[PDB]
Amino acid sequence: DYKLQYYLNDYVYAYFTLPQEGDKQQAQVEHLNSFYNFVPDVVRNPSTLLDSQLVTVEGKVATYKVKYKEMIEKELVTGFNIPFDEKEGKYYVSGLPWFSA
């Protein structure tokens, strides 16, 4: 579904672009949290997104293949699983994501 991909593309971008600057980080966390329909209870490291590709959608879990890099440059690749739902015609992220091979 194209609409789902447009929506989750923004979420994936936010997730994998935590900045280095502490003051920007506080706001970026709040921006990422805006995709959830809940406020997370209190970990991401500074990152840049290189590529993302929606691989499968099973039920209400979208699985992406994400290529990103930290700054510690090795390119990292992971599966990234996002639970989602819809309210009044608009998608939201329904739980914190999890990583897979």
Numbering used by the authors: 92 to 133, 139 to 168, 176 to 204
The authors write:
In this study, we combined structural, biochemical and biophysical approaches to study OrfG, a protein that belongs to Conj-T4SS of ICESt3 from Streptococcus thermophilus. A structural analysis revealed that the OrfG central domain adopts a NTF2-like fold and likely presents more structural similarities with VirB8-like proteins TcpC and TraM from Gram-positive bacteria than Gram-negative VirB8 proteins. Consequently, we propose that OrfG operates as a VirB8-like protein in the conjugative apparatus of ICESt3. Biochemical and biophysical characterizations of purified OrfG soluble domain and its central and C-terminal subdomains indicated that they are mainly monomeric in solution but able to form an unprecedented 6-mer oligomers.
To overcome these technical issues, and based on the secondary structure prediction of OrfG as well as the sequence alignment between OrfG and TcpC, we chose to express and purify to homogeneity the separate central (OrfG64–204: from Ser64 to Ala204) and C-terminal (OrfG223–331: from Ala223 to Asp331) subdomains. Crystallization trials conducted on both forms resulted in suitable tetragonal crystals for OrfG64–204 while no positive result was obtained for OrfG223–331. Experimental phases were determined by using a single-wavelength anomalous dispersion method on crystals soaked with an osmium derivative. A native crystal allowed final model refinement to 1.75 Å resolution (R free = 20.8%). The polypeptide chain adopts an alpha + beta fold, composed of two α-helices named α 1 and α 2, followed by a β-sheet of four strands (β1–β4), the last of which has a marked disruption into two subparts β4a and β4b. Indeed, OrfG64–204 has no α 3 (replaced by an unobservable region) and a strand β4 that clearly splits in two short portions β4a and β4b separated by a bulge that ends with Pro200. Note that the electron density of OrfG central domain displayed a blob that remained unassigned despite attempts to fit various compounds in it. This density was located between β4 and the C-terminal end of α1. Surprisingly, the electron density of OrfG central domain displayed an unassigned blob nicely docked in a pocket localized in a hydrophobic cavity that shares intriguing similarity with the groove identified in Gram-negative VirB8 proteins. Thus, the localization of this groove suggests a probable oligomerization inhibition site for OrfG.
